[PDB]
Each structure stands twice: as C-alpha cells, then as structure tokens.
C-alpha cells in the first residue's frame, strides 16, 4: 500500500521482495530476526528515536535493517543507497548494469548474512563488488550477532556456533583474496589497502579490519608490508 513518507515510497520492487523474505522468515516460531528488530529500539526508518500501524506492517523494510546492521558493524558504517538509478532514463550509461547488480547483490548479501545462510551469502558476495571489505563486514556482523543479547536462548545455540564458523570462513575469504592481490601485483594491493572507502566515513581497509578485530587479516604479510 501507498505511504505518505517519500523515502519509503521511492523504494523499488526488489527491496519490497527482500522485505517479504524478512517478513516470512520473521513469522516462523522462535525466529531471532523478529526479536532482533524488536530489541533494536528504532523507528520505521531505522533512526534511534523510539504511527503504530506503519511500525508493525512495515517493520522489516531494508532501510531499517541497514540501520540495524550499521549499528552492528561500528560507529561509522553508512551505506549510501541510490535507488534513482533503476529508472529507465539511465539506460544509456555504460556501467549502470554492474552498479544496479552490485547494490542489489549487497542488499541480498546482508539479508543472507542475517539469516546465516553461508552458501547463498558467498554467492551474493561473488556477484557484487568490494569483496575484501564485504567479507570483513560479514565476519564482523556474524561475530557481533553471535554475542548479541537477541541471540541468547536454548534454541539458538547451534545457530550461534554456525555464526562463529561462518565468521571464520569469511575472514579466510578476505585473507585469500588479499593474498591473491599481493601475489599478482604488490603495489596495486598496497594501493587497494590504502584506498579510502565512502561506506566507512572515508578511511582505509586495514582500519576497517582492525575495527572488525580480524587478527588473520592483520597478521597477513601483505597487510604487514603496508604497515611497515
């Protein structure tokens, strides 16, 4: 249904589909997703400010989930979304199909990290971009969800274990891709590690890895070479 807020109404169809995946997963008994959104203490747009009809029927929108994941990573996570590029007026642009793919992939990637479905997460991680940074983000979200207040409970134990396992695996992926980069061209790998990314308030990948407490990434020879 149509909403008076212009931000929610601007959202494309696939965002509503991801919202439908969150809703159906949330309606299942003892689901950690519904409990996580209730304990988040945020509004419909995900802002930490604490009508009623809008807050339950559209409680699993992508912007609100982005805000929850944003608080979960660090103090400076801020995904810049641009849903205006899916309009037909941007079709003449050459690289637009990649960005639309990458952005879409990212949103689905985050959803797959939230439900702890590793294979589908790895697949969405491969299609999109910013592979190293996304793997670090995946490791950080799974470790923080695994020690969050919303995941304590008798039925979530195996799930929690799975999260730490998956976290370690994503950390390995981030190391592996990094290693491949350092094997191919060390200067470009150093330039890549020194590159400031807009998604974490303009600071580099090693700083992101340190904030994500990724010991394996920091102990890697490529990262140590850049630090030296």
């Amino acid at each position: 249904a149509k909403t008076n807020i212009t931000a929610l109404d601007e959202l494309p169809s696939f965002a509503l589909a991801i919202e439908e995946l969150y809703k159906r997963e949330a309606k299942k008994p003892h689901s950690h997703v519904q409990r996580l959104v209730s304990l988040s203490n945020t509004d419909v747009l995900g802002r930490h400010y604490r009508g009623r009809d809008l807050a339950n029927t559209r409680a699993y929108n992508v912007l609100r989930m982005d805000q929850i994941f944003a608080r979960l990573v660090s103090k400076d996570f801020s995904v810049n979304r641009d849903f205006t590029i899916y309009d037909s007026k941007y079709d003449k642009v050459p690289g637009i199909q990649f960005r639309r793919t990458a952005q879409a992939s990212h949103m689905l990637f985050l959803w797959a990290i939230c439900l702890d479905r590793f294979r589908m997460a790895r697949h969405f991680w491969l299609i999109g971009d910013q592979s190293i940074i996304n793997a670090l983000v995946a490791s950080r979200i799974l470790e923080r969800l695994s020690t969050h207040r919303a995941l304590q409970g008798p039925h979530l134990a195996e799930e929690r274990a799975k999260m730490q396992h998956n976290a370690k695996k994503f950390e390995e992926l981030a190391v592996g891709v990094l290693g491949e980069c350092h094997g191919s061209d060390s200067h470009m790998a150093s330039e890549m590690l020194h590159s400031k990314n807009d998604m974490f308030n303009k600071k580099n990948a090693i700083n992101i890895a340190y904030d994500a407490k990724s010991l394996a990434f920091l102990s890697h020879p490529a990262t140590q070479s850049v630090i030296n």
């Binding site: 090693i206 700083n207 340190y210 010991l215 394996a216 920091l218 102990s219 140590q224 630090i227």
Partner: protein
Amino acid sequence: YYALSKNLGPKLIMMMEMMKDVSTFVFLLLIFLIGYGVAAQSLLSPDEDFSSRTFIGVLFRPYFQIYGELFLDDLNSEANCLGDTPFTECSRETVRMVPFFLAVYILGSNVLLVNLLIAMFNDTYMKVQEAAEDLWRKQNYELCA
C-alpha cells in the same frame, strides 16, 4: 618501546599471558603461606597479645622462605633453644615442631608449587606463542597508527 622489536615484543605479550599462571600460583600458595604462618608464629611466640607485629610475623618469614632464604638461625634464636644441635634443649617442647612445619611447608611450596608453575608456564608458552605473534602484528598497526 620494546614492542617494535621482533624478540622483546611477543615475549612481553607472553609475560602478560603468564601473569594468570602467576596469579593461580599466588592463590594456591596463599593457602599454605597463611596456614603455616599462623601455626609457626603461634608456636614461636606463645602467651602473647595479638598486635601488628604478630601479623608481620605471619607474613614476613613464610613468604621469603620459598625463595631459599631459610631463617633457621633467626628461627633458632627466637625459639630460645640453647643446644649445640639447633632445635634441641628448648624451654617449651612445642616450639621444636617449627622445623617439621617448615619442612612440610617448603616441600609444599618449592618442591610442588614452583615445579607445578614451571609445568604451567611450559604448557602455556606452547599454547599461546603463535597467538602472541599475531597479537604483536596487530599491536604493530596500533603503534604505527
């Protein structure tokens, strides 16, 4: 400033890790030290009012006797035993148990606890050496930043 060096830095991380084993040794050692100290101080100076000197006597000699400094000449002097053989020909027969108590105490602390601490240190070292190197590599960035 030792942390930049590849030898001194992991050893310092290792030292903070071994502090828990040192604390474990202190908690186990505290039991024998307080027990032997109360028993030994009471046997050496009976019929005396409790004071701060009694507490200092409980703590002073039992702690320093685990490092090999045996106060046996001083203990012998305090026991008022006048014989050529040390804990013989004493005024009270109860004070002659002070070497026996001491013999059990340093058997408990030096033979058992110190060697147990050596075993915990060796095991702990083998367990956390690679983790110390990794943690040193994270602290390399911390110092650089």
